Amino acid sequence: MALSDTQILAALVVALLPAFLAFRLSTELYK
Amino acid sequence: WSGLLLFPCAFMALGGWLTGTTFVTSWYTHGLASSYLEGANFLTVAVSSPADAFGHSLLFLWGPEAQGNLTRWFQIGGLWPFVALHGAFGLIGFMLRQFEISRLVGIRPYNAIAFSGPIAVFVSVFLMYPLGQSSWFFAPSFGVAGIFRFILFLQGFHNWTLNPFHMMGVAGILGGALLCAIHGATVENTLYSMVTANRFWSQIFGIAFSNKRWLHFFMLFVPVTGLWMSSVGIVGLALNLRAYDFVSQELRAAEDPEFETFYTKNILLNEGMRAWMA
Amino acid sequence: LTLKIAVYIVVGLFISLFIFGFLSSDP
Amino acid sequence: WEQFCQWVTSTNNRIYVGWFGTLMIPTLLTATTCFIIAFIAAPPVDIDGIREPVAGSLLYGNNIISGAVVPSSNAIGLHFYPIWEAASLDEWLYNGGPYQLVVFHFLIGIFCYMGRQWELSYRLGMRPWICVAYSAPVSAATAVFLIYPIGQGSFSDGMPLGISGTFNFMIVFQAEHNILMHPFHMLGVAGVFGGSLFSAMHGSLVTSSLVNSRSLHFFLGAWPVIGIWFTAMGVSTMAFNLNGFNFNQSILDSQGRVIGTWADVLNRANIGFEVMHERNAHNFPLDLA
Amino acid sequence: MDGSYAASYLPWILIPMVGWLFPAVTMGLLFIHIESEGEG
Amino acid sequence: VRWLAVHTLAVPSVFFVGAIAAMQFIQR
Amino acid sequence: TKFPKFSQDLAQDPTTRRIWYGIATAHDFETHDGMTEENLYQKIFASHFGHIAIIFLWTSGTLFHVAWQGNFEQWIKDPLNIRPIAHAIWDPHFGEGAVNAFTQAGASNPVNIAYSGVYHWFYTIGMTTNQELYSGAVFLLVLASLFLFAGWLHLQPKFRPSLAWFKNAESRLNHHLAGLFGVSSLAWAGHLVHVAIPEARGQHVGWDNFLSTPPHPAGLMPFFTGNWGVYAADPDTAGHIFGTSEGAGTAILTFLGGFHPQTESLWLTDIAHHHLAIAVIFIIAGHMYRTNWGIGHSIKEILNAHKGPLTGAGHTNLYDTINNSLHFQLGLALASLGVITSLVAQHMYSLPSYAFIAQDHTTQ
Amino acid sequence: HVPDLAFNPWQEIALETDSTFADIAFTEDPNHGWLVGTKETIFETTDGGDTWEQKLIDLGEEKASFSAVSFSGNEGWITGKPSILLHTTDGGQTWARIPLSEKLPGAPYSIIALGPQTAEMITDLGAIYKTTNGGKNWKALVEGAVGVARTIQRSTDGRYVAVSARGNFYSTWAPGQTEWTPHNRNSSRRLQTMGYGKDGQLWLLARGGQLQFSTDPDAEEWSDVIAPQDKGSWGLLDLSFRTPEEVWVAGASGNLLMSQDGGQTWAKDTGVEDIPANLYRVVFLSPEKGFVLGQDGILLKYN
Ligand code: CLA
Ligand code: CLA
Ligand code: CLA
Ligand code: CLA
Ligand SMILES: C=Cc1c(C)c2cc3nc(c4c5[nH]c(cc6nc(cc1[nH]2)C(C)=C6CC)c(C)c5C(=O)[C@@H]4C(=O)OC)[C@@H](CCC(=O)OC/C=C(\C)CCC[C@H](C)CCC[C@H](C)CCCC(C)C)[C@@H]3C
Ligand SMILES: CCCCCCCCCCCCCCCCCC(=O)OC[C@H](CO[C@@H]1O[C@H](CO)[C@H](O)[C@H](O)[C@H]1O)OC(=O)CCCCCCCCCCCCCCCCC
Ligand SMILES: CC1=C(/C=C/C(C)=C\C=C\C(C)=C/C=C/C=C(C)/C=C/C=C(C)/C=C/C2=C(C)C(=O)CCC2(C)C)C(C)(C)CCC1
Ligand SMILES: CC1=C(/C=C/C(C)=C/C=C/C(C)=C/C=C/C=C(C)/C=C/C=C(C)/C=C/C2=C(C)CCCC2(C)C)C(C)(C)CCC1
Ligand SMILES: [Fe+2]
């Protein structure tokens, strides 16, 4: 059966974390 | 009916918190920058408690503590009493809202008796403790960092961990979390369908659940009871410090350098923390 | 050192029994 | 012998065993026995490598609250310390080796408890989310009992198996790491708070009806587990000298003087905890007779 | 435009942000940074 | 009514978010 | 002007060449102002972490969009007729003609058609429902988060690696040959045996019940006794229908050879024995170079020993040359990767592995 | 395992007490030497530490654990917690306790006799007093407290280093300063001990037996982490210099190790590992006369 919209929203919430980690890594590499 | 008695007050409390977290400053109440305007971030911003210059006066807008002025009313810190009082009023309004919803439907009000726990927590932590204290300057701030600072202050000045009431409240909170997780997991396992879970727990845990209504009552009751006891313990701290301090161990350890207990080291931490702020 | 040997054989027999039983699961 | 295995795997026993139980029961029983003995009659375990022995046994003058199975000695460090590496029993008792034995056999036992849970769940014909839920407390226990001692490089600063030991460990942890400002303890706090909230709401709803539920129960059971996973990972990160956000002295003026925020007060409180006295130039008595 | 996939409203807002809001913001910040004088 | 229920929250939020957006630049 | 901070000659340029050449020479760390060898290596290490995280995010996005807006659960029911769907189309600039034209693959909205052949790959490795695709996407998100955090952490001052740690060739070769190649291929063979083949034979195996059901009716007894030929007995028949139990064998490791009669692809049991044997070979190879236990070869001695009478000095001092130079290593790696990529293309267009992928000509 | 040693130069002595050793001191090379331990455990010797007898002294409370003993020429001082200070002018034949001032900040930690009728007094709270009246008076040298501390060590020239109560950071004091200079620890792991080497510089021992050397007076920069037990993670306790070049360290279960090149190579002495005790301190009065003090009345004498 197809995905549920709650799954999509949860996927976005989960993907929030690698965004923050990537921002931190980029700022560290900028130094 | 009362569903319109909390909406204006709750919205005003939310608006006051939002205004405080970005515009007003705690320079003249705590000597700190506590809003986005000065350069603070989401964790740092806080609606700071009023300064220790008035005592228990509520800092009304029409009261002589600000004389109708708004810049003064914000600098004196009346926004904290504003937010706290409006929030408490709206929270009791939602208590009555759940009460009247239950009355309208005709079933026993159990969402209200469960929601009573947060009411007690709020009225004890933010209202009764400063009332028992000298003034609002020792009341907790409306901020993420302010809450942590208040927690550490209460640990330093009361040894709140050693209090039986916070202990049983911790037990209640953790038991509520465990029961929530276990109920969800068992429901999605058997996904009636109670005999399978009952057999699984009878063979795993021995003391299985008699009925699903019993388990639902237990998960309803453990965290609300924990919160109620924690609030009662804080209220006691305001009146009579209920910390069982084993002075026998204290004297036994004071003059014996070959004896030590973790209670003695906790007392060491508390008294050093007291001495740290002069 | 006899206690060390005893503990060694005890734990070894326990883990060997567990793995042997798991590989021949009757049900 | 086959009758023994038939009983072991039998789903008719009064208290289930399973094949994981064959290894769970000895480890749990050993851990309980040695923990009880160490709690009752352990000698004063020196904990910091200095001449300040710490006693955590009832027979040595402790009540229930003050009793705590003392962690290992700083002399041990992180090294594996079984009894046979001790030249005699007294040194092993005085070096906190009971703590290491307890924690190791207990970790094995809880892992095997997970295994037993899953084995019974699948033999009973049920999709096993119960172990997915039970993994969270196991992960937290491993993070706070094994990962943190290794990250800190010693077993001395592990959590003592006692009520007062837990509080002292938590306070020293906050002082040395600032866990409160770390986002993962907030994730754990939100998880447990949401668990309590959902428990209360669901119990009220069910009891008020006493005479979407699938996904409702799923998320109800899933929120606290994710929170506990996140806070366990946060503790594991804190083990290797990672800390929470340090927003202190991050706001200046036109000239360069720090303004100060609530995070600055948190930092000041942490520094106050990590040294249990005042600072310098506070007028010590100059002349003593 | 609309589709039968779950959460069909997500493209409606996500695509304009990644097409207008995100590019405008990043080019603005980059232009500000690459022109800040001094501190070479 | 629904009109007030939405506008009482909408009409200050845009003002506030514009304020914070500008503060994200006013910092030296 | 501040930008570019890593070069002062470009920072004092008053023209627009400053911006162009700042973008151009950004990732050339070897010529930044005041760059040390240690800092160069550490920056390279962190950036490599970044590229790995980006790759994992890209794979997660592919999986997620396929699972969300695709037709995988209908594609499996008829791989020979249905067209795989890559992602949905949301173009406000579209007209009605384009909307009617791009409502293809039996969808209900404008939609693309995947030509990367990921549907065949997912079907071949046993993924049959889009929930599994979603779980894989979330797991890949978590993996990318972990790798980003690893880069951040190994950039920290106290976790910053030393220069000698970056110049330990023997240990790196041993670990990456035995572990990165041998262990990973062994785990892949285990995945094929424990999951992929049973799913090809119409058995649903997932995390919930893989620990119970053994891949073979005789589990681990013949492997230790030495009766390996048991695992190769009773292979899949030529009348085997992929994804069902009709005419399917019980063997897990076979050398059947050739192609599956239906899917026109290599036998999965052949893949299993192939990747397992490759794993064994790589694990043997990984124990070649001495690290600190005395046993093992040292590359410098090997190179200096293999001198030639016609080449004067032979392969003398090449160890120092390759170890000190990063461009030498990058050139060797790029040459090898290009050669094996061409090999991948040549040996995949002629020996398809994924089911029904030969029929779909556009993807090939 | 770890590399072995060519021999064992440490003669083992098992004293008749359950106390934990604290310190040792000697008046003259062959003259009676004293050692202080825990639970009022004082032992006297007459042949350079080879023969020790317990001196049974008692006060109102039997819980005055001695910490430091400092002897200059013949004059001698004993300092112990809770506050107890014995002063002698005859080498210790008779002990005259000096009642400590009630305004003493915290408990006494260590004392050093600078010469005839002098004593530099140190308290665990971080107070540096001095007497030139033989205990009649005391003069402070720092006007503030470093907080609770794990260990305090004295430099050869007179500087002081005090590790924090948990090893999170440390503090230093130089002569003429009214405060203490605090420094965050220069190691990944939490500090355990910090001492002044014979080279005039500092060294630190963190958790897990990690040893770090500083090569500058400011101690801002530090050398690489040195682990005498590479594979083993035993917790090292004390460090000392027999020679300004040779190094010795003491740990747990008799893990007494010896380095010929300033920590570069550590060879384990298997001769003394069999001792059922956790060695605590190593004191080198001279490059020939050394003592290793451990648990339950166990001593090692250098030959
Ligand atoms: C509002 C205040 C508040 C709240 C709600 C929390 C909440 C939490 N804190 Mg926290 N904290 C706070 C304030 C707060 N904190 C403050 C102010 C400080 C500073 C002192 C800290 C410092 C702090 C530390 C240092 C740590 C926490 C941790 C935690 C988490 C507990 C996880 C746990 O117990 O493991 C889950 C439960 C277990 C591991 C129990 C074992 C379960 C096993 C499987 C079963 C064992 C059975 C038993 C042995 C016998 C069976 C009984 C019977 C059958 C016989 C939780 C999210 C911990 C954490 O993050 O966890 C990783 C942690 O390490 N906090
Ligand atoms: C790199 C992988 C990748 C790529 C190329 C795409 C591509 C697309 N996604 Mg998508 N997505 C991805 C991963 C990816 N997705 C993941 C992992 C998730 C789960 C959170 C989603 C969730 C998602 C939703 C919910 C929606 C899209 C939509 C879309 C389409 C609109 C354009 C867009 O990206 O903005 C919107 C997409 C996002 C904001 C996703 C966030 C970006 C992901 C999480 C990480 C990408 C980081 C990447 C590596 C950075 C590389 C930098 C490089 C260019 C220098 C487009 C086809 C929209 C669509 O289908 O419209 C019809 C839509 O509504 N995506
Ligand atoms: C006016 C012309 C026009 C415009 C504006 C668009 C716009 C769009 N079409 Mg489209 N299309 C057009 C004509 C047009 N189309 C025509 C004539 C056809 C043939 C019928 C199609 C067929 C078509 C299909 C089949 C699809 C689209 C899709 C899309 C959307 C993709 C969103 C996107 O790419 O974001 C992301 C933006 C980019 C990838 C642009 C990146 C380009 C640069 C070179 C890369 C960056 C380089 C550099 C590093 C940048 C530095 C950083 C930067 C921020 C400064 C977008 C709304 C897709 C869609 O619906 O999305 C879900 C889709 O599937 N279109
Ligand atoms: C067993 C231990 C171990 C493991 C698993 C790794 C693993 C890794 N190390 Mg490594 N390393 C180790 C020990 C180890 N290391 C030690 C001990 C040292 C010190 C001496 C180092 C020092 C070191 C350095 C200095 C660097 C690494 C890097 C890397 C990464 C390389 C990125 C890559 O392409 O991987 C993925 C590779 C594969 C999966 C295999 C390659 C594929 C080949 C060509 C065959 C193709 C497979 C198949 C045919 C195609 C499949 C098709 C399918 C998609 C359908 C990788 C994750 C690099 C990095 O930055 O990572 C962060 C790097 O710069 N390592
Ligand atoms: C973890 C914190 C926490 C939050 C945020 C929270 C919030 C909520 N729970 C509600 C419900 C409930 N909570 C319940 C049990 C519990 N709830 C708990 C804990 C929480 N409950 C716990 C621990 C329990 C177990 C006893 C029940 C049983 C219910 C409900 O029936 C009800 C519901 O249906 O939920 C969906 C709603 C209350 C609506 C209301 O009173 O309207 C009035 C709103 C007002 C007055 C606005 C609040 C303003 C406050 C008081 C002051 C201002 C605060 C600032 C704006 C924020 C400061 C932030 C700083 C900390 C940084 C709301 C969604
Ligand atoms: C520590 C590991 C040691 C364990 C060794 C275990 C080996 C177990 C062997 C048991 C299998 C029993 C069957 C064997 C009975 C005889 C059957 C026979 O003749 O098979 C004949 C089979 C094929 O013959 C028939 O094939 C038909 C195919 O449909 C049938 O189905 C059967 O497979 C078989 O009857 O072929 C082979 O097995 C030939 C031998 C393969 C062995 C390798 C030698 C080939 C040269 C390659 C070089 C590799 C050398 C190893 C290098 C190692 C490098 C690290
Ligand atoms: C150990 C062991 C034992 C028990 C083992 C048990 C019980 C389980 C072991 C499992 C193991 C060992 C590994 C599992 C690994 C799974 C991995 C690593 C997955 C990685 C995925 C990647 C990287 C990419 C994912 C992808 C996805 C999701 C897609 O959808 C598209 C394809 C692709 C891109 C590939 C015991 C002690 C009993 C005996 C001794 C051996
Ligand atoms: C300048 C330079 C460089 C570059 C160059 C390049 C990159 C090159 C390339 C090259 C190449 C890229 C090459 C290739 C080669 C190949 C080969 C050499 C092959 C061989 C093969 C063979 C020999 C085969 C055989 C066979 C057959 C045929 C069949 C059967 C099987 C067998 C296998 C036997 C470098 C960086 C390095 C360094 C520096 C300098
Ligand atoms: Fe329920």
For chain E, the domains span: 1-40
CA B150 to chain centre: 11
Find residue H76's DSSP bridge partners: H71, H88
Angstroms from G231 CA to nearest CA on chain C:
16
Mutate to test the interface with G, among D19, D182, D218, D242 (most CBs of G within 10 A): D242
Percent of chain F as helix, strand, coil, to the nearest 5 = 90, 0, 10
Q: Please give the single-letter amino acid code of residue D20.
A: F
First vs last C-alpha separation in chain E:
48
Going by C-beta distance under 8 Å and a sequence separation of 6 or more, which residues neighbour residue G141? A11, A14, A15, A17, A18, G57, G60
Phi, then psi, of G126 in degrees rounded to 5 = 95, 15
CA B187 to chain centre: 31
Distance CA H175, CA H195 (A): 17
Report yes or no on chains E and C touching (3+ CB pairs under 8 A).
no
Q: Are D225 and D217 in contact, with CB atoms under 8 Å apart? A: no
Residues in chain E closer than 8 A to A3 (CB atoms)? 5-6
Going by C-beta distance under 8 Å and a sequence separation of 6 or more, which residues neighbour residue H51? H45
Phi, then psi, of D274 in degrees rounded to 5 = -75, -10
Going by C-beta distance under 8 Å and a sequence separation of 6 or more, which residues neighbour residue G29? G35, G40, G43, G44
Q: Which of G269, G319, G262, G259 is nearest to G289 (CA)?
A: G319
How many angstroms separate the Cα of E25 from the Cα of each of A30, B9, B71, E20, E32?
20, 38, 35, 8, 11
- Using the Cβ of D104 and the Cβ atoms of chain C, whether some distance falls under 8 Å is answered with no
Distance CA G4, CA B232 (A): 62
Find residue H250's DSSP bridge partners: H238, H256
Q: Which of D238, D106, D179, D140 is nearest to B178 (CA)?
A: D140
Q: How was this structure determined?
A: cryo-EM
- Using the Cβ of D212 and the Cβ atoms of chain A, whether some distance falls under 8 Å is answered with no
CA B21 to chain centre: 20
Q: Which of B103, B116, B49, B58 is nearest to B80 (CA)?
A: B49
Distance CA B146, CA B150 (A): 6
Number of domains, chain H? 1
First vs last C-alpha separation in chain C:
41
Q: Please give the single-letter amino acid code of residue D36.
A: I
Q: Range of H46's domain?
A: 1-303
Distance CA D154, CA G33 (A): 42
Q: What's the CA-to-centroid distance between G145 and ligand 2, angstroms?
A: 16
Structure tokens at G91: 């173009």
Phi, then psi, of H130 in degrees rounded to 5 = -150, 140
Find residue H291's DSSP bridge partners: H283, H301
For H224, other C-beta atoms within 10 Å of its C-beta total 10
How many angstroms separate the Cα of G204 from the Cα of each of B264, G126, G208, G267, H215?
60, 9, 10, 19, 65
Q: What's the CA-to-centroid distance between G54 and ligand 5, angstroms?
A: 39
Q: Is B86 annotated among the ligand-binding residues?
A: yes
Q: Are H98 and H106 in contact, with CB atoms under 8 Å apart? A: no
- Using the Cβ of G80 and the Cβ atoms of chain D, whether some distance falls under 8 Å is answered with no
Q: Are B229 and B172 in contact, with CB atoms under 8 Å apart? A: yes
Distance CA D237, CA D143 (A): 9
Consecutive H or E run containing G141: helix G130-154
Atom of ligand 3 nearest to the CA of G98: 20
- Residues in G whose CB is inside 8 Å of some CB of A read 43, 46-47, 49-50, 53, 57, 64, 67-68, 73, 130-131, 134, 137-138, 141-142, 144-145, 148-149, 151-152, 155
- Inter-chain residue contact H63 with B258, CB threshold 8 Å: yes
Burial class (CB in 10 A: 0-12, 13-18, 19+), B207: exposed
How many angstroms separate the Cα of G102 from the Cα of each of E2, E8, G81, G90?
13, 18, 17, 11
Half-sphere exposure of D39 (CA within 13 A, CB side): 18
Half-sphere exposure of H60 (CA within 13 A, CB side): 6
Q: Are B270 and D273 in contact, with CB atoms under 8 Å apart? A: no
CA dihedral (D182, D186, D192, D195) in degrees, to 10, reads: -140
Task: Enumerate neighbours of A (3 or more CB pairs within 8 A).
Answer: D, E, G
How many angstroms separate the Cα of G18 from the Cα of each of B18, G8, H121?
44, 10, 66
Angstroms from G69 CA to nearest CA on chain D:
22
DSSP state of G311: S
Distance CA G212, CA D222 (A): 25
* Cβ of G49 below 6 Å from ligand 4: yes
Task: Enumerate neighbours of D (3 or more CB pairs within 8 A).
Answer: A, B, C, G, H
Kindly report the three-state secondary structure assignment for every residue of D228-285: HHHHHHHHHHHHCCCCCCCCCCCCCCCCCCCCCCHHHHHHHHHHHHHCCCCCCCCCCC
Distance CA B3, CA B95 (A): 10
Q: Are D112 and H300 in contact, with CB atoms under 8 Å apart? A: no
**Which residue, chain included where needed, has tokens 């801002």?**
H220
Q: Which mutation among D112, D185, D223, D235 tests ligand 1's pocket best, with the greatest number of atoms within 8 A of CB?
A: D185
First vs last C-alpha separation in chain F:
44
What residues flank ligand 3, with Cβ below 6 Å? E 15, 18-19, 23, 26-27; G 89-91, 93, 98, 112
Report yes or no on chains E and D touching (3+ CB pairs under 8 A).
no
Q: What's the CA-to-centroid distance between G25 and ligand 3, angstroms?
A: 28
Give the chain A residue whose CA is nearest to the CA of G141.
Answer: A15
Distance CA D275, CA D47 (A): 18
Nearest CA to ligand 2 atom 17: G61
Q: Is F7 annotated among the ligand-binding residues?
A: yes
Phi, then psi, of G175 in degrees rounded to 5 = -65, -45
Q: What's the CA-to-centroid distance between E5 and ligand 2, angstroms?
A: 15
